[PDB]
Structure formats: C-alpha cells, structure tokens
Amino acid sequence: STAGKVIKCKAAVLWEEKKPFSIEEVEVAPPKAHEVRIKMVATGICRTDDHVVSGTLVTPLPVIAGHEAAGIVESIGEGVTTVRPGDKVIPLFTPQCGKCRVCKHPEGNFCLKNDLSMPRGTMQDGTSRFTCRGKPIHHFLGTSTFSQYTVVDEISVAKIDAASPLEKVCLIGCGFSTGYGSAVKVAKVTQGSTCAVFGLGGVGLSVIMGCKAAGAARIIGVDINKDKFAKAKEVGATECVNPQDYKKPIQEVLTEMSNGGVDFSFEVIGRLDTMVTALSCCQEAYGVSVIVGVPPDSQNLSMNPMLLLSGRTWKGAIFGGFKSKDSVPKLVADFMAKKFALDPLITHVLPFEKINEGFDLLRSGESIRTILTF
Amino acid sequence: STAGKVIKCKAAVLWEEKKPFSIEEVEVAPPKAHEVRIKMVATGICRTDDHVVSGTLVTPLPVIAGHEAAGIVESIGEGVTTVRPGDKVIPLFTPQCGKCRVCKHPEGNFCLKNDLSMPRGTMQDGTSRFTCRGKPIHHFLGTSTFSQYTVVDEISVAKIDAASPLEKVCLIGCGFSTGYGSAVKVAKVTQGSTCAVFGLGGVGLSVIMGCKAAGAARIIGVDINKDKFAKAKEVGATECVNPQDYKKPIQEVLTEMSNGGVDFSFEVIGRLDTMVTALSCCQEAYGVSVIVGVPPDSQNLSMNPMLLLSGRTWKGAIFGGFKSKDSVPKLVADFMAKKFALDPLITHVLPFEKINEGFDLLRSGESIRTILTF
Ligand SMILES: NC(=O)c1ccc[n+]([C@@H]2O[C@H](COP(=O)([O-])OP(=O)([O-])OC[C@H]3O[C@@H](n4cnc5c(N)[nH+]cnc54)[C@H](O)[C@@H]3O)[C@@H](O)[C@H]2O)c1
Ligand SMILES: NC(=O)c1ccc[n+]([C@@H]2O[C@H](COP(=O)([O-])OP(=O)([O-])OC[C@H]3O[C@@H](n4cnc5c(N)[nH+]cnc54)[C@H](O)[C@@H]3O)[C@@H](O)[C@H]2O)c1
Ligand SMILES: [Zn+2]
Ligand SMILES: [Zn+2]
Ligand SMILES: [Zn+2]
Ligand SMILES: [Zn+2]
Structure with missing residues (x-):
C-alpha cells in the first residue's frame, strides 16, 4: 500500500x-x-x-x-x-x-x-x-x-x-x-608474511582477519589506544604496539621488529603522517603498503620518493x-x-x-x- | 703480466x-x-x-x-x-x-x-x-x-x-x-594497454621498447624536448606530446587522450613534479605508475593520497x-x-x-x- x-x-x-x-x-x-x-x-x-x-x-x-x-x-x-x-x-x-x-x-x-x-x-x-x-x-x-x-x-x-x-x-x-579485501585482494597478503596494521577499529580488525585468513605468520597491530589490543589479538594479531610507548618513530621500531621491514602494511586510520609511516615500515625493496583510511579534505602528504624507487609498492582502495x-x-x-x-x-x-x-x-x-x- | x-x-x-x-x-x-x-x-x-x-x-x-x-x-x-x-x-x-x-x-x-x-x-x-x-x-x-x-x-x-x-x-x-624491466617486470604492462612514458632519453626509450614488447596498443611519449620524438616513435611510441605546447596541465591532457587515464605511466626523468603528474595521469581505479627517475637529494614531493585511495598503484624500482x-x-x-x-x-x-x-x-x-x- x-x-x-x-x-x-x-x-x-x-x-x-x-x-x-x-x-x-x-x-x-x-x-x-x-x-x-x-x-x-x-x-x-x-x-x-x-x-x-x-x-x-x-x-x-x-x-x-x-x-x-x-x-x-x-x-x-x-x-x-x-x-x-x-x-x-x-x-x-x-x-x-x-x-x-x-x-x-x-x-x-x-x-x-x-x-x-x-x-x-x-x-x-x-x-x-x-x-x-x-x-x-x-x-x-x-x-x-x-x-x-x-x-x-x-x-x-x-x-x-x-x-x-x-x-x-x-x-x-x-x-x-x-578491511578483509584490503588484505586478501588489494595487498594479496602471502602465507608466512609479516603484516603491520595501523588502526585497530572495525576496519583494521577486519584487515587483521584477512591477514590471518591469508596465512600471515606475524600481524603487528599498531594503535595509540591500548584498549584496542585485546580484541586485535583475539582476531589474529600476534603482537601490538603503541607508538606513544617508544622514544623512536614507530617506522623504525617496526623495521627493527621485522628484521628490516614488513611484507605488508596497512593504514587504517586516515592520517597523512601514518600513511607515510606505514609506507616507510614496509621492506624497501619488496614491501607493499595499502592506504585504507580516509584523509582530511584537500590535504596533501609529503614524502621522499626514494621510498618508492628502492622497490616499495604503495596503493590504496x-x-x-x-x-x-x-x-x-x-x-x-x-x-x-x-x-x-x-x-x-x-x-x-x-x-x-x-x-x-x-x-x-x-x-x-x-x-x-x-x-x-x- | x-x-x-x-x-x-x-x-x-x-x-x-x-x-x-x-x-x-x-x-x-x-x-x-x-x-x-x-x-x-x-x-x-x-x-x-x-x-x-x-x-x-x-x-x-x-x-x-x-x-x-x-x-x-x-x-x-x-x-x-x-x-x-x-x-x-x-x-x-x-x-x-x-x-x-x-x-x-x-x-x-x-x-x-x-x-x-x-x-x-x-x-x-x-x-x-x-x-x-x-x-x-x-x-x-x-x-x-x-x-x-x-x-x-x-x-x-x-x-x-x-x-x-x-x-x-x-x-x-x-x-x-x-627501462625495459620497468615496463615488462615492474609495471607488467599488458597487451592492448595504453602507456605514458615521461622522459625520452636512453632509459625512457627502453621503457617504450618494453611497453611495445608487452603488446601495448598505445604508447604516449612525453618530453619537453621535441627533438626526442622521432626516435621515440621509431622504437614504438604511437603519439608524442610536449607539455609546453598545452595551456592545461599535461596530466589533464593525458587523461583526456586516454578517455579517463592511462593503464601504465612511467616517470623517467627525475623530477618531483613529473612523478606526481605521472601518477595522476594513470586511471584512478586501476592505473599503475612506476618511478624510474632519480630524485634530487633529500627533497620530498607533495601529493594528495586520494590519488591512491581510489585504487592507483604507485611503485618504483x-x-x-x-x-x-x-x-x-x-x-x-x-x-x-x-x-x-x-x-x-x-x-x-x-x-x-x-x-x-x-x-x-x-x-x-x-x-x-x-x-x-x-
Ligand atoms: N577505504 C575504504 O573503503 C574505507 C572503508 C571504511 C572506512 N574507511 C576509513 O578507514 C578509517 C578507519 O575506520 P574505522 O575502523 O571505522 O575507524 P575507527 O574505529 O575510528 O578506528 C581508527 C583507529 O585508529 C586509531 N588511531 C587514531 N590515531 C592513531 C595514530 N596516530 N596511530 C595509531 N592509531 C591511531 C584509533 O585509536 C582507532 O582505534 C577511517 O578513516 C575511515 O574513514 C575507509
Ligand atoms: N631507477 C634506475 O635504476 C635508473 C637507471 C638509470 C637511470 N635512472 C634515472 O632515470 C632518469 C633518466 O635517465 P636517462 O634516460 O639517462 O636521462 P636523459 O637522457 O637525461 O633523459 C631524460 C629526458 O627527460 C626529459 N625531460 C626533462 N625535463 C622534463 C619535463 N619537465 N618533462 C618531460 N620531459 C622532461 C629530457 O628532455 C630528456 O629527454 C634519470 O633521473 C636517471 O638518473 C634510474
Ligand atoms: Zn565506511
Ligand atoms: Zn643480497
Ligand atoms: Zn644508470
Ligand atoms: Zn561502473
């Protein structure tokens, strides 16, 4: 009617x-x-x-x-x-x-x-x-x-x-x-790889789900809110890090933890700085970084293109x-x-x-x- | 001896x-x-x-x-x-x-x-x-x-x-x-695709060679020195354009020429501005841009990450x-x-x-x- x-x-x-x-x-x-x-x-x-x-x-x-x-x-x-x-x-x-x-x-x-x-x-x-x-x-x-x-x-x-x-x-x-597709389809996470996920909200948790489904061996969650860590581990994170805990920039921390950079990183927040950090923390020759977060309107990031010239892949979806x-x-x-x-x-x-x-x-x-x- | x-x-x-x-x-x-x-x-x-x-x-x-x-x-x-x-x-x-x-x-x-x-x-x-x-x-x-x-x-x-x-x-x-590998191995140029190559020196010509070997249908050479165009066409360029000839930015020109963006673009010069232009001229959802040129020491580029969020891939090698x-x-x-x-x-x-x-x-x-x- x-x-x-x-x-x-x-x-x-x-x-x-x-x-x-x-x-x-x-x-x-x-x-x-x-x-x-x-x-x-x-x-x-x-x-x-x-x-x-x-x-x-x-x-x-x-x-x-x-x-x-x-x-x-x-x-x-x-x-x-x-x-x-x-x-x-x-x-x-x-x-x-x-x-x-x-x-x-x-x-x-x-x-x-x-x-x-x-x-x-x-x-x-x-x-x-x-x-x-x-x-x-x-x-x-x-x-x-x-x-x-x-x-x-x-x-x-x-x-x-x-x-x-x-x-x-x-x-x-x-x-x-x-989140799931960003891991399985866009990044094409591989079995045995090391992933870093920036932002542990609903979308970042879904990225973790996808990285675990794809067989990643290590999935490092990154969030400034440590209350997010327990659920991230429940869905597959192997460890979580809060940038506020460290004296050094988190890209350096993640590079150290991954013995030279991660295989796949994901920005799942929406900040220009964490987009560049997430790119930097993936391995310089073969790493892949995926931007998922929505940036603030009309703002440009600044980055050194040597990060790409060495071999990194940067994409979004x-x-x-x-x-x-x-x-x-x-x-x-x-x-x-x-x-x-x-x-x-x-x-x-x-x-x-x-x-x-x-x-x-x-x-x-x-x-x-x-x-x-x- | x-x-x-x-x-x-x-x-x-x-x-x-x-x-x-x-x-x-x-x-x-x-x-x-x-x-x-x-x-x-x-x-x-x-x-x-x-x-x-x-x-x-x-x-x-x-x-x-x-x-x-x-x-x-x-x-x-x-x-x-x-x-x-x-x-x-x-x-x-x-x-x-x-x-x-x-x-x-x-x-x-x-x-x-x-x-x-x-x-x-x-x-x-x-x-x-x-x-x-x-x-x-x-x-x-x-x-x-x-x-x-x-x-x-x-x-x-x-x-x-x-x-x-x-x-x-x-x-x-x-x-x-x-140049050849940047096309055939890094970009993985596909048969029937449209490519844009920025810089028609020895490396850019070799990119064209690779794009032609991979079966690209269209290969658009871009250089400010029109004297480079004849040899670019000899090795496979289908069209050449000089940005200095146009009132509009060349990314806009190339997007129009390609009916919405190119499949693959290559920066083969070493300028920050052409790296961003080359990324922009590739199709926003599925385009790939490869940086080949060596950038000037310690300088950062500026770009809008919405270029990536829509689906572009940016890489270098x-x-x-x-x-x-x-x-x-x-x-x-x-x-x-x-x-x-x-x-x-x-x-x-x-x-x-x-x-x-x-x-x-x-x-x-x-x-x-x-x-x-x-
Ligand atoms: N690309 C897409 O199709 C798509 C789809 C859905 C959501 N998004 C975007 O994805 C982002 C995440 O969405 P969501 O999961 O709903 O948001 P959310 O629940 O707000 O999660 C974001 C997380 O980021 C954490 N965070 C904030 N600042 C920092 C920092 N500096 N370092 C590390 N962690 C930090 C924060 O504590 C929170 O847990 C947002 O920007 C959305 O707009 C994009
Ligand atoms: N990634 C690598 O492994 C690798 C290897 C070899 C060369 N390179 C770099 O690749 C670049 C090209 O090297 P090459 O072919 O020997 O140099 P080249 O012969 O000088 O060619 C560069 C071309 O760029 C043209 N050009 C200059 N400015 C512009 C502009 N604003 N717009 C359009 N065209 C422009 C110029 O006219 C010339 O034909 C350089 O930066 C090299 O350092 C990188
Ligand atoms: Zn949403
Ligand atoms: Zn080695
Ligand atoms: Zn060289
Ligand atoms: Zn449609």
Missing part, C-alpha cells in the same frame, strides 16, 4: 557540521525508474560517517548519512530487474554500474558512478528523494542509510540471501569487506577492492557458511533513536561497531 | 661537484679475496653519472663514476668462482649477494649490499682500490667504470657471452635493462626490477638472439678521452647514449 506514494518516516538528519544528528520526520519520495526504496533494518556506525560530521570528508549538507547497512526492499521503480519487493538487500556505497571502463576491468572496483571522489549528495539523476521541514536533504554516497526508508539507484544495491541476519551482515556493506554488486552476495553466503566471523566487530547494539549515543561511543574510543536497529 | 701487481692506468676522476672530469693516471690495486679486476672496453654515459656531477645524487667525492659498462676480466682474487681471466663481464651497480632477504625474495632485486641507499663509495670491505696523486679515490656503486681498469666485488659482476659486442651490451649494465647477476647474462643472450635492439639508443661513440664532450652532448639535449671506448 505504500508503493508509488511518499513515505513519511524518521531519519537522522545532519543539518550542520560538528552537531548531533537530528532524529526527525522526513518525506521519502517513491522510486523513479531504476531506483529501489528500502526499509532499513540495521546500520553500522563507520568512522566515515563521523568524518561527515567533523568535516574530514566533505559532502554537501544538510545530509542523511549512513552507508553500512542492510534492509528489505519496500518497492522498485520501473525497469528494476535485480531486486524485488521483500528481498533482503545491502546498499552499495560504491556502485557497480557494470558498463564503465572500471566495472569492465578485471581489477577495478571504483565505478565511475560513485559519489565519493567529488560528492554531490544526490541520486544518479542529480536530484534528491528526501525532504525535511519542506527543504531538500542531500543523500550520502548514494545510500543514506540513517533513515527508516531510503531510495537508492539499482546500481547501488545488492540482493542477499533471504535467510541472512541483517543485524550482522550490515557490516559487509562497509567495514568488514573493506575503496571497499577492499571488491566489485560491490558481484561481491556482497558472495560475502554474505560465505558468512552464512561460517567462513569468517562478524561478531568480534560488534561491541554495542542500540536502537536507531540512540544514534547520537552510538557516535559518542565511537568518539570516546569505547566501541568498534555499534549496530543500530530500526 | 699485471696479475698481483698495482696497475697504473688512465681514469676520469671527479675531484669536486660541478667540474669537468679530470682524465689522468690512477693506481689500481690488485683484487683481494672475492674481488675481480676488469679491463674496461666500453662504458655508457647515463644521466645518473651526471647527477653525481650536478649534486643531484650525493656520493662521496673524489670519485671514479661510471656504472653502465662492459669489459674483460684481467685477474681474480682468491675465492672467486663465477668469472675467470679473459671473460667478458658487465659490472653490476646493483649487486646480487644471493644471501640477504631481498636476494632470497622472489620479487626483490635491491640487494642489501648495494651502495646506493647510503653511499659509502668503497668496496664491500669498506676500503678503496684507487689512488690518484697519492690520495684515495672513492668507488661509485661498487662499479667505477670510468677507468681503464676497475676492481669490483664478485657479487657486483656477471659473466656474459664471450662473443658479445661490448660496445653495445654495456647498455645492459644500466639504461636498457632498467632500481635496475628494472631485475635480479642483477641472474638477469644480465640472460639479457645479453637475448640480445645475441635478436630479441631486442640496442642500436636505437646509441647516438654517439667516442674515445674515453672525450668523456667530457660526451657529458656535454647529454646536457645539451643532443645525445641519447654516448658509448665511450677505451
């Missing part, structure tokens, strides 16, 4: 940077051609959502953020062929249009239809499906999952297993897949290098077959109405992932 | 930066254990040798430079097993000790015994075999080929085909192998990624079997006594490789 009609529902609207979200009524338009309207079931709080609040990641405001989620299709627009009403789905913050040069490339995943490189905060057609207080509200990464209902382009949604536990598999929509629509359903199926665990990432559960408390938990350092239930 | 005796011979000594080489008599000590004394036959002038002169590459002075060469073994020290008097050899400016973690790694070539990272200007034992006017003279990269005779460590020499033309295959000691002692004899065998050409790189052939004139031809833009013959 809601098909083709505007839905009034609650969402978490961000009117201004550095302010709490406002939980209030919004109007959600019905889906246009090749659009899908989704009743959200669960959404995670990723640090990237906090970057919108802090102005680390610039996107137009006011906005409905959220990009790590799962829900159930309420209705489909004309021409949709890949999902149906009642299907469980994960919104894809990295689309997979299937048609652009990146989607056609065997190793590309950062589809040209993304809204991350130069955010406009719209649907693919350049418009918004959201109104609040009579004012248009921006989308975020084509997903806008901090709402009881959202509308996404068909290229930004994947159908998943009907028996999936949505309160767990929402993490496949960002943090798990990103979005969403763990996974082609999103192909990969998300497979990841869910693998989760259902117990090929990896998600519970270690989930430290807190809250109702959606307590979103601000969920952000407080992230900012205090206490949580990994809080899962919000609608 | 000269074996076991000091040899007095002619060499080109660099007494201070930014001055001509001094062509004069030096004394060359006999080889100690695990050392090899070589009568030089031909040596190329590589831009890296000019970097010593210009202070772009810091190494202890006074020095006998030269690292791209070929000669004939005059004598061997105790314990040498890999070459014998009379053998044709190429000195290896990147050693292959066979024992270090890099040598044992399948993809590493920048052996830890190298003298490039932290140049000492000596033999492996920390001493010099050269004196001039009563003063000790430094080695360069364990090779020092601007001399009628040199002494190298065994790990810094490879035996090559006895029928090799040394006046050509000396280029396998640096510029050919570096010494000597085309080739394990030097394994690879050099095979490259020479391949040359003998007509698998690649060296003549396109050779624009001038001068007696050794004309070393300064050879450097002037490089600096003026007029040469690719000058081969000096002893």
Whole structure:
C-alpha cells in the first residue's frame, strides 16, 4: 500500500557540521525508474560517517548519512530487474554500474558512478528523494542509510540471501569487506608474511582477519589506544604496539621488529603522517603498503620518493577492492557458511533513536561497531 | 703480466661537484679475496653519472663514476668462482649477494649490499682500490667504470657471452635493462594497454621498447624536448606530446587522450613534479605508475593520497626490477638472439678521452647514449 506514494518516516538528519544528528520526520519520495526504496533494518556506525560530521570528508549538507547497512526492499521503480519487493538487500556505497571502463576491468572496483571522489549528495539523476521541514536533504554516497526508508539507484544495491541476519551482515556493506579485501585482494597478503596494521577499529580488525585468513605468520597491530589490543589479538594479531610507548618513530621500531621491514602494511586510520609511516615500515625493496583510511579534505602528504624507487609498492582502495554488486552476495553466503566471523566487530547494539549515543561511543574510543536497529 | 701487481692506468676522476672530469693516471690495486679486476672496453654515459656531477645524487667525492659498462676480466682474487681471466663481464651497480632477504625474495632485486641507499663509495670491505696523486679515490656503486681498469666485488659482476659486442651490451649494465624491466617486470604492462612514458632519453626509450614488447596498443611519449620524438616513435611510441605546447596541465591532457587515464605511466626523468603528474595521469581505479627517475637529494614531493585511495598503484624500482647477476647474462643472450635492439639508443661513440664532450652532448639535449671506448 505504500508503493508509488511518499513515505513519511524518521531519519537522522545532519543539518550542520560538528552537531548531533537530528532524529526527525522526513518525506521519502517513491522510486523513479531504476531506483529501489528500502526499509532499513540495521546500520553500522563507520568512522566515515563521523568524518561527515567533523568535516574530514566533505559532502554537501544538510545530509542523511549512513552507508553500512542492510534492509528489505519496500518497492522498485520501473525497469528494476535485480531486486524485488521483500528481498533482503545491502546498499552499495560504491556502485557497480557494470558498463564503465572500471566495472569492465578485471581489477577495478571504483565505478565511475560513485559519489565519493567529488560528492554531490544526490541520486544518479542529480536530484534528491528526501525532504525535511519542506527543504531538500542531500543523500550520502548514494545510500543514506540513517533513515527508516531510503531510495537508492539499482546500481547501488545488492540482493542477499533471504535467510541472512541483517543485524550482522550490515557490516559487509562497509567495514568488514573493506578491511578483509584490503588484505586478501588489494595487498594479496602471502602465507608466512609479516603484516603491520595501523588502526585497530572495525576496519583494521577486519584487515587483521584477512591477514590471518591469508596465512600471515606475524600481524603487528599498531594503535595509540591500548584498549584496542585485546580484541586485535583475539582476531589474529600476534603482537601490538603503541607508538606513544617508544622514544623512536614507530617506522623504525617496526623495521627493527621485522628484521628490516614488513611484507605488508596497512593504514587504517586516515592520517597523512601514518600513511607515510606505514609506507616507510614496509621492506624497501619488496614491501607493499595499502592506504585504507580516509584523509582530511584537500590535504596533501609529503614524502621522499626514494621510498618508492628502492622497490616499495604503495596503493590504496575503496571497499577492499571488491566489485560491490558481484561481491556482497558472495560475502554474505560465505558468512552464512561460517567462513569468517562478524561478531568480534560488534561491541554495542542500540536502537536507531540512540544514534547520537552510538557516535559518542565511537568518539570516546569505547566501541568498534555499534549496530543500530530500526 | 699485471696479475698481483698495482696497475697504473688512465681514469676520469671527479675531484669536486660541478667540474669537468679530470682524465689522468690512477693506481689500481690488485683484487683481494672475492674481488675481480676488469679491463674496461666500453662504458655508457647515463644521466645518473651526471647527477653525481650536478649534486643531484650525493656520493662521496673524489670519485671514479661510471656504472653502465662492459669489459674483460684481467685477474681474480682468491675465492672467486663465477668469472675467470679473459671473460667478458658487465659490472653490476646493483649487486646480487644471493644471501640477504631481498636476494632470497622472489620479487626483490635491491640487494642489501648495494651502495646506493647510503653511499659509502668503497668496496664491500669498506676500503678503496684507487689512488690518484697519492690520495684515495672513492668507488661509485661498487662499479667505477670510468677507468681503464676497475676492481669490483664478485657479487657486483656477471659473466656474459664471450662473443658479445661490448660496445653495445654495456647498455645492459644500466639504461636498457632498467627501462625495459620497468615496463615488462615492474609495471607488467599488458597487451592492448595504453602507456605514458615521461622522459625520452636512453632509459625512457627502453621503457617504450618494453611497453611495445608487452603488446601495448598505445604508447604516449612525453618530453619537453621535441627533438626526442622521432626516435621515440621509431622504437614504438604511437603519439608524442610536449607539455609546453598545452595551456592545461599535461596530466589533464593525458587523461583526456586516454578517455579517463592511462593503464601504465612511467616517470623517467627525475623530477618531483613529473612523478606526481605521472601518477595522476594513470586511471584512478586501476592505473599503475612506476618511478624510474632519480630524485634530487633529500627533497620530498607533495601529493594528495586520494590519488591512491581510489585504487592507483604507485611503485618504483632500481635496475628494472631485475635480479642483477641472474638477469644480465640472460639479457645479453637475448640480445645475441635478436630479441631486442640496442642500436636505437646509441647516438654517439667516442674515445674515453672525450668523456667530457660526451657529458656535454647529454646536457645539451643532443645525445641519447654516448658509448665511450677505451
Ligand atoms: N577505504 C575504504 O573503503 C574505507 C572503508 C571504511 C572506512 N574507511 C576509513 O578507514 C578509517 C578507519 O575506520 P574505522 O575502523 O571505522 O575507524 P575507527 O574505529 O575510528 O578506528 C581508527 C583507529 O585508529 C586509531 N588511531 C587514531 N590515531 C592513531 C595514530 N596516530 N596511530 C595509531 N592509531 C591511531 C584509533 O585509536 C582507532 O582505534 C577511517 O578513516 C575511515 O574513514 C575507509
Ligand atoms: N631507477 C634506475 O635504476 C635508473 C637507471 C638509470 C637511470 N635512472 C634515472 O632515470 C632518469 C633518466 O635517465 P636517462 O634516460 O639517462 O636521462 P636523459 O637522457 O637525461 O633523459 C631524460 C629526458 O627527460 C626529459 N625531460 C626533462 N625535463 C622534463 C619535463 N619537465 N618533462 C618531460 N620531459 C622532461 C629530457 O628532455 C630528456 O629527454 C634519470 O633521473 C636517471 O638518473 C634510474
Ligand atoms: Zn561502473
Ligand atoms: Zn565506511
Ligand atoms: Zn643480497
Ligand atoms: Zn644508470
């Protein structure tokens, strides 16, 4: 009975940077051609959502953020062929249009239809499906999952297993897949290798999971918050180091510990300095460093290109290098077959109405992932 | 006989930066254990040798430079097993000790015994075999080929085909192998791809050769000296562009030409700005950029890490990624079997006594490789 009609529902609207979200009524338009309207079931709080609040990641405001989620299709627009009403789905913050040069490339995943490189905060057609207080509200990464209902382009949604536990598999929509893929797909961690992981939040823990799945012999976790170390060891870290404990720069410490540099390093924080440190700590001739963290808007790092000339490889990726629509359903199926665990990432559960408390938990350092239930 | 005796011979000594080489008599000590004394036959002038002169590459002075060469073994020290008097050899400016973690790694070539990272200007034992006017003279990269005779460590020499033309295959000691391997081994250029090569000197031409051998469909040469374009097209460039001809930055031009960025780019100059440009012009999701040029001493570049986060790979390499002692004899065998050409790189052939004139031809833009013959 809601098909083709505007839905009034609650969402978490961000009117201004550095302010709490406002939980209030919004109007959600019905889906246009090749659009899908989704009743959200669960959404995670990723640090990237906090970057919108802090102005680390610039996107137009006011906005409905959220990009790590799962829900159930309420209705489909004309021409949709890949999902149906009642299907469980994960919104894809990295689309997979299937048609652009990146989607056609065997190793590309950062589809040209993304809204991350130069955010406009719209649907693919350049418009918004959201109104609040009579004012248009921006989308975020084509997903806008901090709402009881959202509308996404068909290229930004994947159908998943009907028996999936949505309160767990929402993490496949960002943090798990990103970290795990950064290890297994992007870095291609090898059996017996030594890895260093900078940042032990939900994404860095997922990197550790992937490095352990790939057979690394040593996985060194690096965080300035020693409270993060116990869970990092639970999921595979062999040792953890806090840069604040040492007189020398941590790249020197890690080089010493690894008898000349690590095989694979990962920056999973979002700081320019730790991007350079993570590069430096990998072995100069054959090391690989992967940037995963989101940098502060418009800022440049400084580095000595001799770090690369000796043989290092430096790369980054979005969403763990996974082609999103192909990969998300497979990841869910693998989760259902117990090929990896998600519970270690989930430290807190809250109702959606307590979103601000969920952000407080992230900012205090206490949580990994809080899962919000609608 | 000269074996076991000091040899007095002619060499080109660099007494201070930014001055001509001094062509004069030096004394060359006999080889100690695990050392090899070589009568030089031909040596190329590589831009890296000019970097010593210009202070772009810091190494202890006074020095006998030269690292791209070929000669004939005059004598061997105790314990040498890999070459014998009379053998044709190429000195290896990147050693292959066979024992270090890099040598044992399948993809590493920048052996830890190298003298490039932290140049000492000596033999492996920390001493010099050269004196001039009563003063000790430094080695360069364990090779020092601007001399009628040199002494190298065994790990810094490879035996090559006895029928090799040394006046050509000396280029396998640096510029050919570096450029060719940077394409075929480090970048792993693919069939049908689009490449951009920044800098069309001897090394950049060799990159083009490798890109063509790997089956690239398009190879765009980039140089500010349009006189370099004809030879670049002869060896495989499909297009050449001069940044000075355009109102827009050349990364934008190249991105437009390639309908969204190139598959592979190469920086083969040694400038910070062109390293960043070359990275930027590769496709943001799956492009690869390789730094080959030697940067100016102690200078850092500035870049936006979103260039990497989207999916680019940035790497550099010494000597085309080739394990030097394994690879050099095979490259020479391949040359003998007509698998690649060296003549396109050779624009001038001068007696050794004309070393300064050879450097002037490089600096003026007029040469690719000058081969000096002893
Ligand atoms: N590339 C992608 O597709 C992608 C996906 C998801 C998240 N991200 C980014 O990845 C980063 C991590 O996200 P998350 O795991 O949700 O965040 P998080 O939970 O905030 O974890 C970051 C961790 O970094 C630690 N940290 C902060 N500063 C330092 C320091 N100087 N040295 C060492 N550790 C430090 C911090 O204590 C925390 O445990 C953020 O920048 C996200 O925006 C990127
Ligand atoms: N990585 C290695 O193992 C390795 C080996 C050999 C050479 N090198 C370095 O590679 C670089 C090239 O050596 P080479 O081919 O002998 O030098 P080269 O013959 O001087 O060629 C350099 C080319 O760059 C061109 N150039 C200069 N400035 C610009 C600019 N702003 N934009 C575009 N083109 C420009 C110039 O006109 C010339 O044709 C040097 O920095 C060497 O030191 C590195
Ligand atoms: Zn696409
Ligand atoms: Zn995220
Ligand atoms: Zn070695
Ligand atoms: Zn050279």
